[PDB]
């Protein structure tokens with residue numbers, strides 16, 4: 001679009017990213033910092049430049065927009081930041097939340113790791129026949 | 139400045155998304171309900187798939203004196 | 208399960224060990240005593256696909272995960288588009 | 289004026305694809321396609337139905353009257369209708385049970401005009417079932433029918449051909 | 451009338467299929 005033109009992450013064309021299923025459902029988008037005008041690599045096959053603004057490129061699906069790291073941290077910078085856009089608002093605050101850099105401690109959140117019994121002798125197969133009264137819905 | 143021609147008629151320009159043809163020939167409601175039954179579409183199709191398709195196949199296969207396979 | 212592939216081990220230390228894997232694994236959740244004291248097997252897994260890049264590196268000493276999830280979204284396979 | 293429009297990948301942002309080159313968005317083409325259901329929904333789907341039914345109609349003749357199973361027919365019921373007044377029928381409900389992937393149940397009547405449209409978020413759907421009926425209803429009377437001024441037209445024919 | 455038993459290959463091999471490829475597009479929706 002143009003009458004509102006708010007860009008940041010230079011490109012020109014491409015038959016790569018975003019298409020019909022990013023309106024009709026979910027969106028996904030990455031943002032970042034940078035020093036002085038440098039030419040990058042890109043998801044979807046292409047390649048462009050930087051300088052600033054928000055430095056806020058929008059991306060099809062979130063496996064796509066963290067790869068700016070799997071190389072876009074072999075090119076300096078603490079700060080890179082992707083969220084989740086809808087067609088209307090929030091719940092799922094993607095790189096928002098608490099702390100960041102998957103390998104620190106504030107809280108514990110989810111995970112667990114065990115099931116009922118642990119990795120031990122599950123030569124014990126599947127137990128009860130699935131029946132609505134004995135704790136196997138987890 | 140002559141080839142500064144002040145863009146020999148700007149145009150306005152961008153014609154538009156605006157308006158480079160009127161529309162569709164006035165031929166219409168010359169079919170109003172004319173051919174309805176898909177213009178009474180109010181529960182159908184089951185009717186046209188026994189009917190039409192029992193007469194693209196009833197007489198369609200049968201024949202009174204072969205002209206065989 | 209809905210994503211349930213066990214990569215657990217016993218060290219759950221993550222230095223020169225394992226990090227790789229699109230989003231899924233925001234761990235370092237130190238359980239009150241396991242050496243380099245960071246533990247378990249996952250965080251909130253309702254986010255990403257089905258790798259086994261999950262092990263490939265840093266032990267699971269048993270199995271190692273793969274696809275087993277069945278109940279499988281789309282954001283859970285690249286292609287809901 | 290410029291090198292090629294104000295030079296652009298898409299309408300605007302270059303993170304959607306389409307790579308608007310020619311064969312995509314040259315005023316040379318994009319106009320040869322918008323009295324019809326390309327950019328904007330003229331009148332309802334009602335009428336477009338038969339220009340669609342019919343044009344596609346009197347096709348499928350020489351295809352199955354000059355390439356027919358045992359071809360070049362000496363049967364007064366071929367060089368036209370014959371059977372093919374079957375394709376339009378095998379597909380004039382190949383459609384209706386796709387307009388069951390459309391429901392959304394209404395009745396506004398806005399094929400008359402108001403304030404220079406947009407139909408706005410006109411993309412995505414925003415054409416309910418009671419629309420896709422009056423089209424695939426225009427299809428039957430466009431298909432079957434469009435098959436006969438094929439057939440009905442004698443055949444004054446050009447041919448050879450080498 | 452003479453020689454006419456040809457309806458139990460379309461009603462089956464042809465029309466019965468029409469029904470279900472239509473109908474059973476109930477797997478998509480109904």
Ligand code: CLA
Pocket residue numbers: 378379381382467468469470471472
């Ligand atoms: C060259 C030939 C060849 C041959 C001889 C076969 C043979 C077979 N294939 Mg097959 N296949 C082929 C090439 C071939 N294939 C290729 C090139 C591909 C892709 C590269 C496939 C992909 C494929 C798949 C995925 C499968 C098969 C399966 C099969 C078997 C199922 C047979 C059957 O009766 O289904 C009958 C098929 C139908 C009834 C569906 C056809 C529906 C059409 C007619 C509808 C027309 C729509 C119409 C316009 C709408 C009108 C509306 C109306 C309905 C109201 C059969 C052994 C299947 C199998 O393994 O099952 C045991 C299945 O797994 N094939």
Ligand SMILES: CC1=C(/C=C/C(C)=C/C=C/C(C)=C/C=C/C=C(C)/C=C/C=C(C)/C=C/C2=C(C)CCCC2(C)C)C(C)(C)CCC1
Pocket residue numbers: 457458461462466469470474
């Ligand atoms: C010509 C004619 C005729 C014939 C008839 C007949 C008898 C036929 C047969 C037919 C048949 C022989 C049929 C069968 C049928 C069936 C149906 C109609 C239903 C259905 C369906 C479906 C398709 C489903 C299936 C399934 C199931 C069960 C579930 C899911 C999946 C599956 C697959 C499993 C008569 C005289 C009579 C009438 C008139 C004329």
Ligand SMILES: CCCCCCCCCCCCO[C@H]1O[C@H](CO)[C@@H](O[C@H]2O[C@H](CO)[C@@H](O)[C@H](O)[C@H]2O)[C@H](O)[C@H]1O
Pocket residue numbers: 171395396397
């Ligand atoms: C063959 C009979 C056709 C003559 C028209 C009378 C019956 C039409 C069938 C629809 C049944 C409702 O009867 C109706 O007819 C008129 C059309 O002329 C309607 O007028 C309108 O109705 C619709 C209601 O959203 C609108 O999409 C249209 O603008 C118009 O058709 C009146 O709302 C009502 O009187």
Ligand SMILES: OC[C@H]1O[C@](CO)(O[C@H]2O[C@H](CO)[C@@H](O)[C@H](O)[C@H]2O)[C@@H](O)[C@@H]1O
Pocket residue numbers: 197200201202203
């Ligand atoms: O059985 C096929 C045989 O019958 C046809 C089918 O339309 O029609 C006959 O029916 C009329 C009715 O008046 C008779 O006068 C005459 O025999 C045929 O037109 C015919 O095509 C087929 O030959």
Ligand code: SF4
Pocket residue numbers: 214215216217218219220221224225245246247264265266267
């Ligand atoms: S590195 Fe592998 S605990 Fe160790 S095996 Fe478990 S994730 Fe960390």
Ligand code: SF4
Pocket residue numbers: 227228229230231232252255256257258259260261262272
């Ligand atoms: S192993 Fe599974 S959870 Fe881990 S990154 Fe891969 S897909 Fe995600």
